[PDB]
Chain A
């Protein structure tokens, strides 16, 4: 934060893009009531999986959005969840790296 240049700015931008990452509608997935800890104190069953995979619930699979934005547990759909105009093949909802 003391000495900054064009190379330093490029390195900071690359580090930020590596660490943190026309409609671009962000699906504001709200805390689902069907969980396991402070949810319904129940184990993982077919009901919770079907509610998180078909309905808009970010329990296990993920809360699907409009415009065919199917966000399942391992669905790498080409959506536009980012803040840019690139609707490329985004990673899965889990994105386990």
Chain B
């Protein structure tokens, strides 16, 4: 998140520079380097990290069954 904020700030600074000094022709080349960062962005913010935590939740899944077993304990109370 800090890197994304820094990238947004750097994009604003580059836009201000292009508005103030438009003679830069290599800036677009940096976008190609962003492709490398895009690799990391392939796991950036949306829908891939929580699955890892789901691993731990897997154990909790059986705990959910234990919760059902808790209800089954009522049968013993019967």
Q: How far apart are the CA atoms of A91 and B45 in the complex, in Å?
A: 18
Residue pair B59, A94 in contact (C-beta under 8 Å): no
Residue pair B59, A44 in contact (C-beta under 8 Å): yes
Residue pair B50, A95 in contact (C-beta under 8 Å): yes
B29 near A: Cβ within 8 Å?
no
Within 8 A of B (CB), among A55-75: 60, 73-74
Residue pair B50, A73 in contact (C-beta under 8 Å): no
B57 near A: Cβ within 8 Å?
yes
Q: How far apart are the CA atoms of A44 and B60 in the complex, in Å?
A: 12
Q: How far apart are the CA atoms of A5 and B40 in the complex, in Å?
A: 32
Chain A: interface residue total (CB-CB under 8 A)? 10
A36 nearest in chain B by CB position: B56
B33 near A: Cβ within 8 Å?
no
Q: How far apart are the CA atoms of A94 and B59 in the complex, in Å?
A: 14
Q: How far apart are the CA atoms of A96 and B59 in the complex, in Å?
A: 15
Residue pair B60, A96 in contact (C-beta under 8 Å): no
A97 near B: Cβ within 8 Å?
yes
0/1 per residue, A31-62, Cβ < 8 Å to B? Answer: 00000000000001000000000000000100
The 8 closest A-B pairs by CB, nearest first: A96-B50, A96-B54, A60-B56, A94-B53, A73-B60, A94-B57, A19-B46, A96-B57
A interface residues, Cβ below 8 angstroms from B? 19-20, 44, 60, 73-74, 94-97
B interface residues, Cβ below 8 angstroms from A? 45-47, 50-51, 53-54, 56-57, 59-60
